């Protein structure tokens, strides 16, 4: 029969995805979810786009065509549209605003893209990206009381270890 | 446009499954794969079953009905059949024989079952189990030269962190 006495069971916290709506707002909704401590607000994008436009218009010395791929005013008009999709340029701006490292695991390349890698921020948050859609990641614990965590120490590299595994498994399921 | 300059890419080694045949030999084939350094030998089971029977018959003081769920002779006849499936009793015996901790991640319970947890072995190997089929796990590296690794230090808990993630993702895909 079974053998239940011949081993010691172990468990640890794991990272899990929380799914946000599959629309062009997903970057903004995912970022809000993790910097807010794990709370979905599907209406956050217009305020976040306005914030990004304010930041970019206020620093044209930095935010030029070479960075934005559009003129500074053209970019600001563009980010304020309700139909545009966010990406790396906006994640970099939001990382600086929130003063938080944003680590995006990419399931197409099995790599983490770290925004704020050298900034000395004390916290990091994680998203997962498949080339079109972003979702937020959180740490779930193996106990019934601890709520999920979305904001990590920037010295916590366990989350990076686990995120990469999740990306690798996703890319293998895709293949 | 794209934003490729605004982040630092990072990667790390990840654990991956190597698939062994979907038949009743899978425990034995998976164990051979990892203790042999990552080599599939689909013909290993008869020799491994004979070894287990020899070990059990040689220590009836320990290997009684309370451990085996059969009489010692009934167990030895049973393990030598070519149609029987291995499980925890056999993993515990093989862990002692190989002097290696065998860590089975269970995708039904999202837990690692550690055989040899307190034995002071200096190496560990990992399998993944879904309630019926075992496959071996290995560490693959993000470079073209390092071959995959199946035998870890028993102080390497990164492999446990990553295995649990893989189990969690498997149980969520099942649901």
Author numbering:
A (entry chain A), B (entry chain A): 135 to 309
From the paper:
Sixteen ovarian tumor (OTU) family deubiquitinases (DUBs) exist in humans, and most members regulate cell-signaling cascades. Biochemical analysis and five crystal structures of OTU DUBs with or without Ub substrates reveal four mechanisms of linkage specificity. Mechanistic and structural studies of three closely related, unstudied OTUs with distinct cleavage profiles revealed four mechanisms for achieving linkage specificity, namely (1) the use of additional Ub-binding domains (UBDs), (2) specific recognition of a ubiquitinated sequence, (3) the use of a conserved S1’ Ub-binding site on the OTU domain itself, and (4) the use of an S2 site enabling DUBs to bind longer chains in a linkage-specific manner. We selected three members of the OTUD family for additional investigation: the unstudied Lys63-specific OTUD1, the cdc48/p97 interactor OTUD2 that cleaves atypical linkages (Lys11, Lys27, Lys29, and Lys33), and OTUD3, another unstudied DUB with activity against Lys6- and Lys11-linked diUb.
To understand the specificity of OTUD domains at the molecular level, we determined high-resolution crystal structures of OTUD1 (aa 287–437, 2.1 Å), OTUD2 (aa 132–314, 1.5 Å), and OTUD3 (aa 52–209, 1.55 Å). The catalytic domains are structurally similar to each other and to OTUD5 (Huang et al., 2012) and S. cerevisiae Otu1 (yOtu1) (Messick et al., 2008), root-mean-square deviations (rmsds) being from 0.6–1.0 Å. Catalytic triads are in competent conformations, as observed for pOTUD5 in complex with a Ub suicide probe (Huang et al., 2012). In OTUD1, OTUD2, and OTUD3, the corresponding secondary structure elements are present with or without Ub bound, and there are no large-scale conformational changes in OTUD2 upon Ub binding. Full-length OTUD2 cleaved Lys11-, Lys27-, Lys29-, and Lys33-linked diUb. Removal of the N-terminal UBX-like domain did not affect OTUD2 specificity, but deletion of the C-terminal ZnF domain or point mutations in zinc-binding residues significantly reduced activity toward Lys27-, Lys29-, and Lys33-linked diUb without affecting Lys11 activity. S. cerevisiae encode only two OTU DUBs, yOtu1 and yOtu2. yOtu1 and D. melanogaster (dm) Otu1 are orthologs of human OTUD2 (38% and 53% identical in OTU domain, respectively), and OTUD2 and yOtu1 both bind cdc48/p97 and are involved in endoplasmic-reticulum-associated protein degradation (Ernst et al., 2009; Rumpf and Jentsch, 2006).
